[PDB]
Ligand binder design. Sequence first.
Ligand SMILES: CNc1nc2c(CCc3ccc(C(F)(F)F)cc3)c3[nH]c(N)nc(=O)c3cc2[nH]1
Ligand SMILES: CNc1nc2c(CCc3ccc(C(F)(F)F)cc3)c3[nH]c(N)nc(=O)c3cc2[nH]1
Ligand SMILES: [Zn+2]
Ligand SMILES: [Zn+2]
Lengths: 351, 351
Amino acid sequence: DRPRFSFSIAAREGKARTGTIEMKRGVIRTPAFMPVGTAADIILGNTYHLMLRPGAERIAKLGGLHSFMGWDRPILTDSGGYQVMSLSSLTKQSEEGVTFKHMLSPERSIEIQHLLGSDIVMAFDECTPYPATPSRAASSMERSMRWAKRSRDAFDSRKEQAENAALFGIQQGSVFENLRQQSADALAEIGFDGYAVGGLAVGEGQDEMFRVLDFSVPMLPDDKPHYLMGVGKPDDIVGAVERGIDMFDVLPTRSGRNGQAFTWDGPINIRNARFSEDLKPLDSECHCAVCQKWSRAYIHHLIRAGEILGAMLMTEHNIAFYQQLMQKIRDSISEGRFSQFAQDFRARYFA
Amino acid sequence: DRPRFSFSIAAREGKARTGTIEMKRGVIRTPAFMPVGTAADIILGNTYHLMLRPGAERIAKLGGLHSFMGWDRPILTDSGGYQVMSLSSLTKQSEEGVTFKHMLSPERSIEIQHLLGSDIVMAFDECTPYPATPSRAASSMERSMRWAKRSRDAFDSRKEQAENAALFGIQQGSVFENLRQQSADALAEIGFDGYAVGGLAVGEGQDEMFRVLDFSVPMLPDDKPHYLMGVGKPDDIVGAVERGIDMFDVLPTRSGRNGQAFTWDGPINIRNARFSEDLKPLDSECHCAVCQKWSRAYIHHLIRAGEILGAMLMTEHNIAFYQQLMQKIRDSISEGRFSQFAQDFRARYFA
Ligand SMILES: CNc1nc2c(CCc3ccc(C(F)(F)F)cc3)c3[nH]c(N)nc(=O)c3cc2[nH]1
Ligand SMILES: CNc1nc2c(CCc3ccc(C(F)(F)F)cc3)c3[nH]c(N)nc(=O)c3cc2[nH]1
Ligand SMILES: [Zn+2]
Ligand SMILES: [Zn+2]
């Protein structure tokens, strides 16, 4: 039987790594893309949504999220505070947690994720808004580190969870190297199964995000997986892998419902009239079932007609494109040609 | 190679028949349900929509509807006037045809259907509004019969169409037995490959529809297929088969996008809170892939969350339910137990 959690690195090129995470419910090939489940080796559950509808205790009554969704492989859940702060109408923050229109604390977040039955559990953190002053970023990061210890202790108190799931800590510190270092040190002292880079993809832009990754990822333990939260476009993924990221989480699903398809030649808006007579598939190389069978012209027609089928075909293609991207990344690292792949990818994607 | 068109009756029970239509692109088992293609042995194309977007000449440039949609089996198209009269903003009717905000005439309707490349072509008719006085129903039916002859002649003038497609005539006459008889006589004198009962499912209600079918279907040639246009709910289908109908055309697709699932125990609205914890599949006997894998509770969750996936699962189930219904109808007629099936179906569907 597979272990609770075991990360092995099979090959490296620069800071890029490729390998596997073994968990009880399956193996996760890295670098990994983790799509939303309601849209792969692992999918994301939506803690914030589920805790409100139908509620975590109701999901548990129905047998947990794996049974509920019909997915027997690993599931990752976020800790819910990012979404509370982004989407909730009124919020009140304190050392105990966040109250919103409900109190979400480290202990309650871990318990919710336990009731949902997810395999990779995120610590309950605060995603510092951007921009942040050094003082505010430090106070925020310090609270997140106290919450990371509380998250660790709550997870360890639940036997079923401690024995069968894994817990990731989340680095904060905004764009400041010294605070990122303090955060990494605090997380490593507590000890986690994996480490996420939090507080990015919050308006800073790709150049700044990459600059922060340049110094932040090496601060995390090398022998554990690195998860960049909230990222991202295909070019963000490639650049983050070049900087040592192993795991990524939404755009392909959102894009698919809004007319946007990803291709090796960049994104296209299939509703544009230039596709009305285009008999090529969405992407010329894509092996997905949509591209095996249907043209841009027909998908354009369906979306313009308001047919749900059009958006679903777009979404299927986008998810498959992302997984082909991840496979090409894994193969190129394993073959020692990832630097060349990244160069060729960018030249064509942006041409 | 299959013939252009050949209808064979394999078994009968009362007025009900089961058999096959052979056409060049495939065999159609009857009684047949014909779903919309943009949602089976045959699908429906949407003449009215296609003639406006992208236009019939553009569909032909793209290789015809079979290539466009990725469907190599038979396609049926309506003649477009029903939809023009239902949906168009302004219309002007004359002996030549209908002008609307375009002129659609028998000749142009046949040409459009030729450019689309459909296999079963409907004559261009007028669906008389309900209720209609005897005088208005007669004048309308008489115009439709003149248009049926023009449709026949236009179809026969196009070699590719005459040699590879089939043409159905459409009976009109509102609810009046004498006019239905005159219409059937006129259509049989012209000669068609199949015969549709038009002018029903326009607000008259099931009792009146069945009363009209009781006398109208026997007026059509017994040795040719009978297509009831616009029908309908599962109970309408069963009763129409009991009255000699062989072919049916939308509700399962519309219902699937509006929260309604068909089951052997009647329709259910999956958004209702009573399904939020219901672990049973949509239908307890359905063999479709949705019912093999997911619960009412999860489909409820997806639709309530606004996820496109929920509506698509509902639609897949509804289409599959309809096809299981048709298979049970065909099998029960072939086995001589259709009368019993209809009785058992109604008792449970309405319980
Ligand atoms: C978009 N930018 C971004 N997203 C971020 C997220 C949310 C991750 C998430 C949550 C739920 C889903 C769901 F679709 F499955 F619902 C998908 C992804 C973060 N989460 C935490 N905990 N700390 C962070 O510092 C952080 C930074 C993030 N930047
Ligand atoms: C709803 N009631 C109804 N629909 C009727 C229709 C439309 C059939 C049709 C057209 C297009 C589609 C599409 F979904 F594929 F687009 C699907 C079905 C009739 N059509 C003609 N020609 N004469 C009639 O006398 C008649 C009576 C009809 N009663
Ligand atoms: Zn594709
Ligand atoms: Zn089903």
